[PDB]
Symmetry: D2
Subunit: 436 residues, 4 copies
């Protein structure tokens, strides 16, 4: 109690009852479980991103606006169904719904567009249809590709090649859907930007009772690697027809978050279901509760010991900033990023503080939704003559956006992470600031 006594007198006894704080202060995992309280409300913003599959039930511009308000971060286009003309209309409807909020840049929410490929099917390499669908994604500016049935590192190289020179910035999330993919996992993850645990096909290729081992191992290996991991298929399946999910479904969503999944997905739930906005609201509600129940004491310590020593200033500054954020119960970590890399390196250490990422890249702002706990802000202002002043304006943009969105209150402490010179890869500074 001596390690909380002073901050208890300062922040109050009511602060330390919320967001499962008594449970996270526990010395053991058994004590942590015993200290979980249903009356302990989550205060932090929802960090696990929600991928919603776009279909007939969620294609209208007006419906898409409701899903954005409900918590949709990434829009998935399943290229197994629909024509190129159909998917181009979906992309346009999504962009129209997202840009309807651009009038207020302090409260604008970027939404990523992901292309889920049909797959190789009976074939060995990349199918002819996949090459055409990938060329479509490049021409239409998709941010992510969920490459279906990845079975080796050569499969991911084929997808990167089909994207061409212009599709270099697109993120490749390899869907592990069969036994070969599970066995060659380490070689696949090495060449991928992240992974997707495609439980539907995986539950047919391997025994249904073994899928949870594959999900847990893949999530843990992705967490170790610092790369995003998506949990997919049948998460809230009953919500396709019913307004409330089963006890197994709510348990499943919460357990995917507890395992360490960066993203959670809705397939039929939002693409063809009667309750698409309600499925997004439900995933948001469960994720918020599950994230508070994460045992950060052992999680951070294990992530820290497992991570190898590094001489990269971005990597060093990231662990220093996350450690600083935990020490003062920082409301947020504000980071300036160009490619999203600095925000990704903060994210891998799983801080309780929100990683508010300020970027000028619209693509990077959409793609950082793949990383848990990263809240992107798109800076639209033109560059100042003095670089040091341009940096200060972006930091103030992050504070004003964070104050307006409820992340920051006056009196709160924030960690600011910046670089010494412009251009990607020079992040090396950490500042402790008091919100005034």
């Amino acid at each position: 109690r001596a390690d909380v006594a002073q901050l208890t007198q300062e922040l109050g006894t009511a602060f330390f009852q919320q967001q499962q704080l008594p449970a996270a202060m526990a010395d053991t995992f058994l004590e942590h479980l015993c200290l979980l309280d249903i009356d302990s409300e989550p205060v932090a913003a929802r960090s696990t991103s929600i991928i919603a599959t776009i279909g007939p039930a969620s294609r209208s511009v007006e419906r898409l606006k409701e899903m954005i308000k409900a918590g949709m971060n990434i829009a998935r286009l399943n290229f197994s169904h629909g024509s190129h003309e159909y998917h181009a209309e979906s992309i346009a409807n999504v962009r129209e719904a997202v840009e309807s909020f651009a009038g207020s840049p302090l409260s604008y929410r970027p939404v990523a567009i992901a292309l889920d490929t049909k797959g190789p099917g009976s074939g060995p390499g990349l199918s002819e249809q996949d090459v055409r669908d990938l060329r479509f994604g490049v021409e239409h500016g998709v941010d992510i590709v969920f490459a279906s049935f990845v079975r080796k590192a050569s499969d991911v190289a084929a997808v990167r090649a089909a994207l061409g020179p212009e599709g270099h910035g697109i993120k490749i999330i390899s869907k592990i859907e069969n036994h070969e993919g599970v066995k060659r996992f380490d070689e696949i993850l090495e060449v991928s930007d992240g992974i997707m645990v495609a439980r539907g096909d995986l539950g047919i290729e391997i025994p249904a009772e073994k899928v949870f081992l594959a999900q847990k191992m893949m999530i843990g290996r992705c967490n170790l690697a610092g790369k995003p991991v998506v949990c997919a298929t049948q998460m809230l399946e009953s919500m396709i027809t019913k307004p409330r999910p089963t006890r197994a479904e709510t348990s499943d969503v919460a357990n995917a978050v507890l395992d360490g999944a960066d993203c959670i997905m809705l397939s039929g739930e939002t693409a063809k279901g009667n309750f698409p906005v309600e499925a997004v609201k439900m995933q948001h509600a469960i994720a918020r509760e599950a994230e508070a129940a994460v045992y950060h004491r052992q999680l951070f310590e294990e992530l820290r010991r497992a991570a190898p020593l590094s001489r990269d200033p971005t990597e060093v500054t990231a662990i220093g900033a996350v450690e600083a954020a935990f020490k003062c119960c920082a409301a947020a970590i504000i980071v300036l990023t160009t490619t999203g890399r600095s925000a990704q390196l903060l994210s891998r250490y799983r801080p309780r503080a929100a990683v508010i990422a300020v970027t000028r890249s619209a693509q990077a702002a959409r793609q950082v939704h793949l990383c848990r706990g990263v809240f992107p802000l798109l800076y639209r202002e033109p560059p100042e003559a003095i670089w040091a002043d341009d940096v200060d304006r972006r930091v103030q943009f992050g504070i004003e956006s964070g104050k307006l969105r409820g992340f920051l209150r006056v009196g709160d402490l924030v960690i600011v992470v910046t670089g010494w010179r412009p251009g990607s890869g020079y992040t090396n500074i950490m500042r402790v600031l008091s919100i005034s």
Copy 2:
């Protein structure tokens, strides 16, 4: 051998951290140990057939639940009889006979405050018909448990009371309820309506953890494999749910509509068996045992002291089983609370105790039917040999295996105090 250390997630359990443990989980690592989490199957039209109950017993059913919300007393007496007929059809081979507990799930107080009039009549029925367990519905305070204990009368003293926590008051008064109950049931169906649906997993995880700490059984209930009522295979969320209830530390898992009225009752039991076996191998025993050890308070009870010594000994030699003689099941329960990887093979002459130990994870009851030998230590050895022969026949033991034998210094319950290291010959 090298082959032994690749099975039952042994590389994953040897890991120094939980993150390393997760990364070392192998889908090609097959489970070796017997399924420890017991399966409760609700009895209804789909599962009352004597021939069907035999198939469910073979599939892995350990406890038969009678839902007193549906049916008359005449209906439930026919269920009890059909279950007993199916269970006793295997009594001809005592080395492979599997005891099955009968549990009475009460209707509940509903609008009322105390124990309803129907519940008092249903509880008296349970006593008259020899039920082993009671799942008392909508327990809100310790006085509710006392009312159930009182309705059971003097003859229902041996019956176990598992308090169903189905509402917010029960979740808040949990500590006082668990103190007076024999165990708990996380009744997720009503709980998911009384409290926000998105908070039920916190209540499940807290209750399971508190029960694990207390050394009392905890059942995870409702909608575990719901789609198996109509479909031959479950959803990805359903298999995940079953596995996560086992990983959380649930002693029992339950089937309601999946076995009461569904099209796949035997298939539902086989599925819960298959998932539990996988999930139990994936349990991180290194931290689990260490935390259970540290958390458990000091004790001057020889049964309690012998239990921790035996579990520690079982871990040191990778014991295939811990064979314990128990009259009331208590010795077996105290071994179980430390979550050993070794099976707790419990030999008992009490048919009621043999049925009731299914509530404790990892306890495999054996009913000894032979009459007592004149020389006590000879009778004790015959029981230990019965446990070895049963374990050999059922696949738990092989020649060359090491086994921990837990016994007492004199006849009668409460005198366990000895732990022996034995080599299977």
Copy 3:
């Protein structure tokens, strides 16, 4: 059941701490030691401690092992010392429940490349005179231990070889030396000349830790209470040194000139006794036993499995003692390696084993001289009660206390497999 006063003594609040930093902060100088002194005291016999009457005073002060330095004195001189020690020890053998055995150790002169001619003659002398231990000087490699082992003629294979690590070669070849030795001695005198004086503490701490991991005795030797040769009280560095050797994990502590030629031989023994008692209470058993537990490999030896089960059981009930029946001292040694807080009362019929177990920390030997009983189980029982009766008489046990009893299933060495939880009546 024990009281608030029990939990304030023997640094019990400090041992319950969750961290080592918290453990240090909870050390109380007002917390008095209750347990008996476990770290054994080796006293060098010389002109200052050779008389039968002086030896009786040193036995009463706490001397467990008598060291004969073969660097000084003739074979006739050392034979008279052996006879005087045996006469002083047997003067108390009329009251067998309270009789204390004392080991005799021969410290060799030293090598030259191989075993010297004088060492071969001195080792033959040790065998002919029934010495229990040999402190082999300047061991540099495993071949040196084999030469001493070979020199312990045909009769002396039972003698324990404690390898003195006195130079850089011994420190580097440590693993191969410890593998073939019965234990080690950190001979700091010569080691402080062969290697930089400021590096000796690293060698001491590494060697003690490796011996603790191996389960073999480790002696801390030279200049522990050097000022007590001339002065009646030691320096602040000397008391700190003795306490830190105990805290590091040393099984034995030694007095060279302090006892052999000094002015205060009985006072140096009393001082080492006083400091060791304090230091043992301050040991952080929570992390010590958990690390010893994890570091020790899995074993399929019933003696090794029973030992960890018994120490775990002893800790759970705060057992006053662990009574182990041993013939070679092995079972007591395996209990000792897990560093229990309970005294290991070892009952043996071997006078040599009774003397040699003083090398193991926390082992209190009892030589049992009684005529054997016709029924082996009754003979087992008489020795267990002999251990309790002696324990009661010496202050280790009271009626109501809990004890752990380790025995085997059949007579003869190497069959230890039972652990019983007994209440002292």
Copy 4:
């Protein structure tokens, strides 16, 4: 080759038992000696030429025992020490500051004695940096010493000597009002049983480490070196164990004040401390210090833990911190980093007083303030790099953590930077 030195295999161990087993006598210490050495000044160590040798041997703090000698005697000692220290001021990149500490006579049979009030006023008039207040029994005793220093003796550090049973029992109230503690084992070994002193030492060191306040281990550390050129096996063990316990400072009383080998006793304490610091199990030490330290909303406190964590991640050669009062360097020190805390200060008093904190290497900056504050900071950081390069702490290619503030004055430390040397 880097990973075989400074007990790096032993520090990477998953358990403390494995850590002990991995200690290598052939693993040489590379880092600079962090535990500061206090040397008592007497007849054997009073000459200006003798003092210069002790400064070169490793003396960081000079103790004046006011139990022996007159005010005129001690003023001559102060002057001789200052003359010996300032003889090296010609090269500011290699100049070593030396603190002057006044050890009071004590209350004896008696509150604060009349002689102590006179000796404390002497210390103020002569600019002493530290006071070792003898026989502190309660918090009111510390308040009496603070009062006897007056309005001129505000910046003086008070190290309370715990020498009796009452002081050990009232420890928490004494430490709360003191700047640090001294485990005065000589009198403590007479007031309490000799066999219980190690419990008091270990508890006090641990409580000081938890509090983030300096702790000195004192008396009979190398006692045999008063007459002999080499210490006993118990003495080398004792010095090493005081460092291993977590003592910020180690002391030499008769060993330097009246002993035949004063320079040799300083060299011996330096040699043992260097070895003992490498053998510190940082894995569990840092983790326990981190968990035990309470949450803080002070940016200096938050930046300190962030910087130490960053230093461990890259195996930083040093942490360079810009400090006015020594507080920022003290907060880095409490987390026991393996990287040297190179503290750049303009205060000469602060530079002398940071020797009380383990691992802090003070540098006195003697250049005038620049017009642009941004450039004045960069010059002090470069002074720290050049001093560190010259003194062997840094090489080109090494990584350093730089800790600065956002605005001048004390208490505004809030920035951490990862820098690559040259």
